[PDB]
């Protein structure tokens, strides 16, 4: 049995220089579409405040 650090070392040495990055990613079709109002909702303000109160 070998450690994580040494398992990563071995794999790095096996695959380095020898693995092509695929020509297609799979999300190309989403690129042009790519919001951040996730952090400013009224709901999140209420939840932040609720979380502080319960601590």
């Amino acid at each position: 049995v070998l450690s994580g650090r040494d398992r990563l070392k071995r794999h790095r040495e096996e695959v380095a220089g020898k693995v092509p990055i695929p020509d297609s990613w799979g999300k190309e079709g989403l690129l042009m579409g790519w919001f951040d109002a996730a952090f400013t909702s009224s709901q999140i303000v209420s939840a932040r405040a609720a979380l502080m109160a319960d601590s």
Binding site: S3, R5, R12, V19, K27
Partner: protein, 484 residues
């Protein structure tokens, strides 16, 4: 006696797990993992994270059986409804979990707590993931600190309020029929798509998820590697940093245990007047502190690139994704990222600012690619990282900072061994040129077997042209927001 549901999310461990400890201290426990893709929305996890999570859930499942319980898995359309059904079938009177700070989880955790409370169920959440809650640190008038060094200086002038708990002797089971709550196996969660298995074969050989593998990794790092971290962490190849990030992200190792081990080594080395060791521990603890800081800025500050004239060129995106930029450190990094699901922080800095500053690619594109390929993909650490390279954060890179590859190479890969490992086409270049081969005398390129355009790509943009386009880009960003 008392019956409590223990809702796991990003805390896939037994040691120092506060919600699990509190539930086990009160009676019998029903651990469950509830998967609701529709509720994750914009932040549904990527290929690499989902691979890791799947391995780690099976690991945790095995750990909970050996303890005399189980892990029930539910893929649902609604987290409230799945929890309400677990309560109806098992008869428990309380739900506990470790709270999270990302906007999806904050809102959902708030929605669960409000609904359970009105249905007459006790609920409590616990700090499973931080040394300092994001509201515990504030200045002299009581406001956020807005700077890492100031934030961390203030944290070291306080003590940790978090209290580590001992592990349980046994877990008293609560059993429920899989059919009465619409439960399923780990494979029925759909964490891994058929088309992903070929990519995920690389991550399988490179990593073993699971809390018991985290403990092994933390012990080997503390006991044999922390001492040299101050030096190792300044190189991007080989044995550089701890490799703890995927495990910290999934809660497979408690950050309070990381800090305790590293701080106690620091105190030992202070007594041995082993100053290099004290520096290492100090630098490593500063990394932990960046992670605390990432939660702190995402919880307290509710975007200066708003009007930046991005060049939405899907072709130069592909060239960045594939490592066909012609900048060795960048092209090595994207190869390492695809084959191992991880890269050194400085290679993360280099690769990302190359996308933004040299190519003017929209930052959301590089973030989304990171989100799909990093084992440790973590919303708050990733936000802070892109803030840092984009000048959107007090003490980070300035937006007009165009790093010179020749100097990055000399600082972070001074032997060139990072280039020689990931770009063997370049390995015969004298290390003086290997990080910017386009500046080498044609006679040196030829003696070293490098032919730009045929076996290693020509620079996809010239640095002197990139600096001009970046200065124009910044002018128009600032001209425009004054105009709007």
């Amino acid at each position: 006696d008392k019956k409590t549901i223990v809702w796991f999310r990003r805390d896939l461990r037994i040691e120092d797990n506060p919600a699990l400890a509190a539930a086990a201290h009160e009676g019998s426990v029903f651990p469950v993992f509830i998967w609701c893709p529709e509720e994750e929305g914009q932040f549904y996890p990527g290929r690499a994270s989902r691979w890791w999570m799947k391995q780690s859930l099976a690991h945790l499942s095995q750990s909970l059986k050996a303890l005399g319980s189980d892990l029930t898995l539910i893929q649902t359309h609604n987290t409230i409804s799945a929890i309400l059904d677990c309560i109806r079938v098992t008869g428990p009177t309380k739900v506990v979990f470790n709270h999270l700070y990302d906007p999806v989880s904050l809102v959902r955790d708030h929605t669960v707590k409000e609904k359970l409370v009105e249905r007459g169920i006790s609920v409590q959440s616990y700090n499973g993931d931080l040394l300092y809650e994001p509201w515990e640190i504030y200045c002299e008038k009581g406001k956020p600190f807005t700077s890492f060094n100031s934030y961390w200086k203030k944290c070291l002038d306080m003590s940790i309020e978090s209290v580590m708990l001992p592990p349980p002797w046994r877990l008293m089971p609560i059993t429920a029929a899989a059919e009465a709550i619409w439960a399923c196996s780990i494979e029925e969660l759909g964490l891994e798509n058929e088309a992903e298995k070929p990519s995920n074969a690389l991550l399988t050989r490179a990593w073993s998820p699971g809390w018991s593998n985290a403990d092994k990794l933390l012990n080997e790092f503390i006991e044999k590697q922390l001492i040299d971290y101050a030096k190792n962490s300044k190189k991007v190849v080989g044995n550089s940093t701890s490799l703890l990030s995927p495990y910290l992200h999934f809660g497979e190792i408690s950050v309070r245990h990381v800090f305790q081990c590293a701080r106690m080594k620091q105190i030992i080395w202070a007594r041995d007047k082993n100053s290099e060791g004290e520096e290492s521990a100090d630098l490593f603890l500063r990394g932990i502190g960046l992670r605390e800081y990432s939660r702190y800025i995402c919880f307290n500050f509710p975007s200066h690139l708003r009007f930046f004239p991005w060049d939405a060129d899907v072709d130069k995106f592909k060239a960045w994704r594939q490592g066909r930029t012609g900048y060795p450190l960048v092209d090595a990094g994207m190869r390492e990222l695809w084959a191992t699901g991880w890269m050194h922080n400085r290679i993360r800095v280099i690769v990302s600012s190359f996308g933004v500053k040299f190519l003017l690619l929209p930052w959301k594109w590089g973030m989304k690619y990171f989100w799909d390929t990093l084992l440790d993909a973590d919303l708050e650490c990733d936000i802070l990282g892109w803030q840092y390279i984009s000048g959107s954060i007090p003490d980070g890179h300035e937006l007009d900072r165009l790093d010179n590859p020749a100097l990055q190479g000399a600082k972070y890969d001074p032997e060139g061994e990072y280039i020689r490992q990931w770009l063997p086409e370049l390995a015969r270049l004298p290390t003086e040129w290997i990080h910017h081969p386009w500046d080498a005398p044609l006679t040196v390129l030829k003696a070293s077997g490098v032919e730009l355009g045929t076996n290693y790509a020509k620079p996809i943009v010239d640095i002197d042209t990139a600096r001009e386009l970046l200065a124009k880009a910044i002018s128009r960003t600032r001209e425009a927001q004054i105009m709007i």
